[PDB]
Design a protein around this ligand. Structure first.
Ligand SMILES: *SCC1=CC(C)(C)N(O)C1(C)C
Length: 164
């Protein structure tokens, strides 16, 4: 397994616009289109992002293209972030995937704010890290997703995903 497969599990795949748990227009594999409440504005963001008049519908290949752009942006966001980079360097492969997952879902700045969790992760205090990670709006907004990611940070294995 790898970051792409991991995220594909967590985000799913939608070919039409839907709203995320924040009520924001999204499409494909967790691609946020805009925070605007206007569906029309969201449809235009989609056309802009895809490069054609989509009438609000994309193909699987288009979804995957947005996905590749998004994972790339998440990884670059971590590598250029003073708080995230050092931690990412210290992590093993599987745990690095969990970090990329968090950034993909809530952004570089939002994850960089998990100050205590990041400290515990850099110190390989996995049990403590897991507990600190749950002290967050994230743990409550998307519980099952946050649990899979947290459990991954604790075990350093793909077990939370392979079961599925
Ligand atoms: S849907 C029309 C539209 C609006 C804006 C975001 C300015 N565009 O890029 C297009 C041409 C998609």
């Amino acid at each position: 397994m790898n970051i792409f497969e991991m995220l594909r599990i967590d985000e799913g795949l939608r070919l039409k616009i839907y709203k995320d748990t924040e009520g924001y227009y999204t499409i494909g594999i967790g691609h946020l289109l805009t925070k605007s409440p206007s569906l029309n504005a969201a449809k235009c963001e989609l056309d802009k992002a895809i490069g054609r008049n989509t009438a609000g519908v994309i193909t699987k290949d288009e979804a995957e293209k947005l996905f590749n752009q998004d994972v790339d942006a998440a990884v670059r966001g971590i590598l250029r972030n003073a708080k995230l980079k050092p931690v990412y360097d210290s992590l093993d492969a599987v745990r690095r995937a969990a970090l990329i997952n968090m950034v993909f879902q809530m952004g570089e700045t939002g994850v960089a704010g998990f100050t205590n969790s990041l400290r515990m992760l850099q110190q390989k205090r996995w049990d403590e890290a897991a507990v600190n990670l749950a002290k967050s709006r994230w743990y409550n907004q998307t519980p099952n997703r946050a649990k899979r990611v947290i459990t991954t940070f604790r075990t350093g294995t793909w077990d939370a995903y392979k079961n599925l």
